[PDB]
Amino acid sequence: PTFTERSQLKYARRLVVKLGSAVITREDNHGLALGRLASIVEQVAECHLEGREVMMVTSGAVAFGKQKLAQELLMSLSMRETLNEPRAAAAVGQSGLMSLYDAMFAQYGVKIAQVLVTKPDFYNEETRNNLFCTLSELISLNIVPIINTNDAVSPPPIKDNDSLSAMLAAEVQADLLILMSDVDGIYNKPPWEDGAKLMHTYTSDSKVKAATWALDRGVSVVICNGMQEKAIKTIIGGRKVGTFFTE
Amino acid sequence: QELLMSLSMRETL
């Protein structure tokens, strides 16, 4: 909890963006949200060509894989039949997503590095320390290691891309940790009920537990709205967006 | 019209 106010976010040195799955894929499930994806890549490249050391934790590989595999299944039927999986989709989606990120980042000079982790990799101490060394070595060379879960051969208290992001932010000792989710923030009761209020400053449920854990270890977690324009640039810019987590 | 109706959608493209 080094930071304590939304003006001390200008001096965040190492932040860990975390893209949800509602951010990348659209509601139609007919492609990507290329607008939001390219805008987030633009903001990350602009806040990384500035001096900070950012390292995204992407997500939403299975959705891309589902789209690609549905197309391949349609395009491989007999015209007699036309007139009347987690892992395969994860593999296809991971390949395609890294290709897209690579193109969008190389348009800015930056370089990315796909680092896929699993769940047991956080249990074995040797592997965990080796992974920390790898991540620090990648960050110090001005690379943007785009972490993700090895969902193609072993699908997954790490149980998501959220708790994994909190663990990474705790281990790599990051200042900020942006949990770009689908909701606009945190309320004391869901919007379709009484008491609709935003909790801009959090005093002292999965996202909430992950944020609490990462707050009790040095990081300062922020939960933003993914479908909001200019999320990261204003979260860092100091404006009151999302719900900031301090004591 | 007896064969081409029983090809995969990929071959006929």
Author numbering:
A (entry chain A): 45 to 128, 141 to 212, 229 to 276, 296 to 338
B (entry chain E): 115 to 127
Paper excerpt:
The bifunctional enzyme Δ1-pyrroline-5-carboxylate synthase (P5CS) is vital to the synthesis of proline and ornithine, playing an essential role in human health and agriculture. The P5CS molecule contains two domains, GK and GPR, catalyzing the first and second steps in the biosynthesis of proline from glutamate. The GK domain catalyzes glutamate phosphorylation, and the GPR domain catalyzes the NADPH-dependent reduction of γ-glutamyl phosphate (G5P) to glutamate-γ-semialdehyde (GSA). Our results describe the assembly mechanism of P5CS filaments, in which the GK domain forms tetramer and the GPR domain forms dimer structure, and both domains form specific interaction interfaces.
